[PDB]
């Protein structure tokens, strides 16, 4: 419902329209990650390295266990009834997750029954299976390092030296875990954690984890980059040093009667300088309303915008008037920098500033020029079949719009400044003027 | 053209003056990167690993090929004429890049003629050369890993185990590529991509890439950190899994009659509290005008500021009056935190707050004190040859300026608040006051 005809003289050229979709209703898979490697084939020369390693892992995992455990004591079957005075203080998101943690025990319990075989795996990636009821994939951190790089050299490298290499490899691993599972993760109950963070537990190799669980399609890569694929820690075993992680696989749901429209800014002139109109670049339209989108958190594809939550936000009435044609209310900033783009292409048509850009029409050799009455000049193939801007030759299409586009003016709104310091100064200035006028109305009222 | 004499009582002490320079007019070099390793010397035991690897690379590269290819169909030689109705929608930056992509084929074509030898290289870094017309450097991802860590162990590690190690190494590589060449790169035409991102294709080893192409000088390190060195993908070969990358090497051009001046803030007092004056810390001066610079995007050196584009921005008139001496208009914030610095050194002179800092003059043992009439107190070697602030002893120079500096006042501007919440509240407050006054003028007008 935008008036693109008016906006294009202001300097906002219609760009690409995209569809809008948001993550919902996931399916799940459970995977086991071991944080301690199997050192049996080099057990002759591990020194006291593994013992110190185990101690540190308990120090790291103990706070995770304790924190999730409080939402584990404070439920009982009814679905499930959660105890409000037991947890006492919680957010809605935190509560939802605590419920999911409870339901998830059915599987954690069946997985834990396999602990005897989990404890003794000896490969980086292995499938365990005994019954229909209990099967699981197990990933082991650093196992390949040990069986490819240390074990084959046990008869070449002196045992003290192999102890030192194992110790360094383990310390590198802990360093990386600490950025994610260290006390930075002060809330391990919530399920917002991405798979790219969880995978640090296996060396950051999220591809192995995800390929172990599924298969590849182009849509999946979009979900992974849009951060819609997350997981939750459901169980921690401090005696075997492993965690059970639930991975969510979302279904994307598009919003009907909705789209996102982008605009391409072009600087324009009003008097004797260059100016930029300030509007949101991406406008979200739903039904007949216009709202703002915090698109910086959403993956943008050539066809759609994929968000991992609803990012719609409020917009003021002056921007609606701006956008729907009362352009008098559209604010502008001054151009100082030479980096501001001065032209754009839309549907074969050029919108360009020919006061600050050398424009000429190649077909004839005639110059193209802009008077001080136009903001931007519109160039198409009914006036100039082909044209050159700077050093680029562009064939043109036809403007399917008004014929006398370049003959009409548009109202221009006020100058603004957007810098953080400038904003504070503008506030002070307005306040000083308002406070003096308040005293003048008092004198006006008394006399 | 700044009045440093007035600004120093406000709390802004003149710091270092730097030169300003911006990236332009690059020279180029073309390099080939292979995303798939040579596994011939261990071809006996690769399982089906390489086949799955090749499939995933085509899935990753196919969208890059397709996206750049549309600016490849839509040109023909004239320089070159680009088809405006073929591409339809484009930005100026996007168009410029599409032209560069076209011209670049002369070299891509000569490089592609070497595909037979590119396909069969077997080293991490190799030079191919047959003719003057066609030579190229080729970098191969993961090749050293294979010939140093896997191949020498083929007779020690069981073949199934070597297949698993190869698979893990390849999956780690893809994980890293996906942050750059995954569908995050939704526009592979533009040439703004830095070399530090491109180099992820070779394991993030940008030093090997750049040393292969050139030589080292201190100036180069500044260009690399200032992100002025970028490249472009010009060609993708989905049948050999390699890309041809054009690397740009810029010439830095300084701006004449221009400099950047920094100011060092010192808190000061006006009444019974500490205050900080708010100005941009870095001021850009060109000719006789003052403008703001978004220096946070520019490398700062001891001699100059190196930007990879023009970052000059607008400034309000009140800040010009601030800076050129009408200090009544300089806004200030209240100090709450104990972390605010309370002194600075400039050209051997100390500007310090002696109400909140213990100041004394070591040469005599006499205390230095500040009355409530001074903002900051200026201390130099004509009053006190050496002085102590807190626990640091500083010899002093002479103030080459007014002699009675500490005898004169300065106007102080209004209090401000800068917090995001405070800004919203201040706007609401101003609006409520203004709306009530509007009704009062209506009563004043009717009677």
């Amino acid at each position: 419902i935008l008036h693109y005809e008016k906006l294009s003289k202001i300097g906002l050229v219609k760009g690409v329209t995209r569809k809008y979709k948001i993550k919902s209703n996931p399916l799940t898979k459970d995977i086991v990650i071991k944080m301690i490697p199997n050192v049996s084939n080099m057990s002759q020369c591990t020194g006291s390295v593994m013992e110190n390693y185990k101690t540190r892992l308990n120090g790291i995992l103990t706070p995770i266990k304790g924190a999730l455990e409080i939402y584990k004591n404070c439920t009982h079957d009814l679905g499930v009834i959660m105890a409000g005075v037991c947890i006492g203080i919680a957010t809605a998101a935190q509560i939802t997750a605590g419920v999911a943690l409870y339901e998830a025990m059915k599987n954690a319990d069946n997985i834990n029954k396999l602990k005897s075989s989990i404890e003794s795996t000896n490969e980086a990636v292995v499938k365990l299976q005994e019954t229909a009821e209990k099967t699981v994939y197990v990933l082991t951190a650093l196992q390949d390092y040990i069986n490819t790089n240390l074990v084959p050299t046990i008869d070449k490298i002196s045992c003290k030296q192999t102890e030192l290499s194992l110790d360094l490899a383990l310390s590198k691993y802990l360093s990386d875990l600490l950025f994610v599972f260290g006390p930075n993760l002060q809330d391990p109950v919530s399920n917002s954690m991405t798979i790219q963070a969880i995978s640090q537990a296996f060396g950051g190799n999220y591809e192995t984890l995800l390929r172990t669980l599924g298969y590849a399609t182009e849509d999946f890569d979009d979900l992974l980059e849009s951060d819609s694929i997350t997981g939750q820690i459901i169980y921690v075993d401090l005696s075997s040093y492993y965690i059970i992680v639930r991975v969510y696989f979302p279904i994307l749901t598009e919003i009907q009667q909705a789209y996102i429209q982008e605009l391409l800014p072009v600087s324009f002139n009003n008097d004797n300088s260059e100016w930029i109109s300030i509007v949101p670049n991406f406008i979200l339209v739903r039904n007949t309303l216009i709202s703002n989108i915090e698109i910086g958190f959403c993956l943008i594809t050539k066809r759609s915008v994929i968000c991992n939550q609803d990012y719609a936000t409020p917009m003021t009435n002056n921007m609606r008037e701006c956008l729907t044609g009362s352009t008098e209310k559209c604010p502008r900033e001054l151009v100082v920098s030479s980096h501001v783009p001065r032209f754009a292409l839309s549907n074969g048509v050029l919108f360009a500033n020919c006061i600050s850009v050398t424009c000429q029409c190649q077909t004839t050799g005639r110059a193209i020029s802009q008077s001080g009455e136009q903001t931007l000049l519109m160039i198409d193939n009914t006036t100039c079949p082909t044209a050159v801007l700077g050093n680029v030759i562009i064939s043109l299409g036809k403007y399917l719009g008004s014929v006398n586009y370049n003959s009409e003016g548009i109202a221009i709104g006020p100058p603004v400044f957007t810098d953080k310091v400038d904003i504070s100064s503008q506030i002070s200035s307005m306040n000083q003027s308002l406070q003096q006028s308040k005293d003048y109305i008092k004198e006006a009222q008394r006399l | 053209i700044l009045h440093y004499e007035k600004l120093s009582k406000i709390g802004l002490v003149k710091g270092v003056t730097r030169k300003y320079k911006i990236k332009s007019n690059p020279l180029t070099k073309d390099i080939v990167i292979k995303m798939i390793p040579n596994v011939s010397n261990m071809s006996q035991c690769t399982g089906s690993v390489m086949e799955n690897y090749k499939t995933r690379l085509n899935g990753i590269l196919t969208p890059i090929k397709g996206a750049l290819e549309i600016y490849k169909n839509c040109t023909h030689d004239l320089g070159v004429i680009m088809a405006g109705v073929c591409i339809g929608i484009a930005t100026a930056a996007q168009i410029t890049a599409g032209v560069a992509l076209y011209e670049a084929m002369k070299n891509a074509d000569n490089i592609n003629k070497l595909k037979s030898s590119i396909e069969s290289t077997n080293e991490a870094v190799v030079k191919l050369q047959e003719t003057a017309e066609k030579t190229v450097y080729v970098l191969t991802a993961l090749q050293d890993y294979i010939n140093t860590n896997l191949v020498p162990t083929i007779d020690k590690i069981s073949c199934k185990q070597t297949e698993l190690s190869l698979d893990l190494a390849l999956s780690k590589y893809l994980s890293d590529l996906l942050f750059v060449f995954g569908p995050n790169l939704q526009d592979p035409v533009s040439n703004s991509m830095t070399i530090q991102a491109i180099s992820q294709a070779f394991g993030g080893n940008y030093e090997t890439l750049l040393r292969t192409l050139g030589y080292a000088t201190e100036d180069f390190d500044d260009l690399l950190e200032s992100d002025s060195i970028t490249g472009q993908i010009i060609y993708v070969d989905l049948s050999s899994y390699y890309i041809i990358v054009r690397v740009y090497f810029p010439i830095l051009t300084e701006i004449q009659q221009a400099y950047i001046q920094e100011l060092l803030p010192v808190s000061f007092n006006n009444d019974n509290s500490e205050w900080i004056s708010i100005v941009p810390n870095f001021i850009l001066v060109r000719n006789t005008l003052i403008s703001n610079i978004e220096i946070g995007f520019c490398l700062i050196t001891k001699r100059s500021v190196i930007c990879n584009q023009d970052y000059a921005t607008p400034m309000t008139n009140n800040m010009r009056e601030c800076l050129t001496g009408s200090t009544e208009k300089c806004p200030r914030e209240l100090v709450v935190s104990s972390h605010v610095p309370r002194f600075a050194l400039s050209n051997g002179v100390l500007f310090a707050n002696c109400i909140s800092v213990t100041c004394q003059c070591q040469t005599t043992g006499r205390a230095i004190s500040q009355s409530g009439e001074q903002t900051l107190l200026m201390i130099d070697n004509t009053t006190c040859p050496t002085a102590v602030l807190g626990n640091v002893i500083i010899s002093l120079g002479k103030y080459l300026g007014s002699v009675n500096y500490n005898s004169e006042g300065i106007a102080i501007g209004p209090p401000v608040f800068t917090d995001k919440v405070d800004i919203s509240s201040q706007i609401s407050s101003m609006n409520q006051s203004l709306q009530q006054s509007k009704d009062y003028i209506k009563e004043a007008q009717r009677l």
Partner: antibody
Amino acid sequence: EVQLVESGGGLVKPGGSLKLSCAASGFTFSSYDMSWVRQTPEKRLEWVAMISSGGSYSYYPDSVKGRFTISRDNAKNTLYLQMSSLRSEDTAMYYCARQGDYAWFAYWGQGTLVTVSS
Amino acid sequence: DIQMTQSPASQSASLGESVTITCLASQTIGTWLAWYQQKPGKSPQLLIYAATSLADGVPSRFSGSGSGTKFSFKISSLQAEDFVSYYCQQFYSTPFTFGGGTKLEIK
């Protein structure tokens, strides 16, 4: 209305070959992954093959992997399956189906018939 | 491979009677299971995907639930038009497979 239409069926001598095709209409072809599903005379359903939305990935059961090729032409809105070395084991109805977000089959065509006999 | 067993192969019912069929997975599959209905002379149609949601256009007569290894499908009030074949399939991992199929008869 989604209208998948299979064709190209018929009688093949064992050891022969046959190319099938399924034209699409009523939805955007280029937005969905698709598959072939086989129904035996005994009414057992079997997955035969799938191809992802952009054509970069495909998957097959071991019994047809290496024999069959699944491909798509997005410009023509057409799904193709190239069968080879046909066996009597392959006599069945062949259905063209459109997948949902994972691998449930939301839309099915009428199906065509492939018969292998000497 | 993941396979599942569907049973009873056949059962009878009266019109208006409630009926249930079950599939048992060889290995746990979460809720990654779908149910289909096939009429004679026609292709199968989807009724229930992801174990518990109904497909667009599916009558309220149909419902289902289950997770892990055991899944079930229910018709609360069987119509003459419902005495056809029913199938379950897993979409947990490739190869995707279908169960044997079950048939309702009229008493």
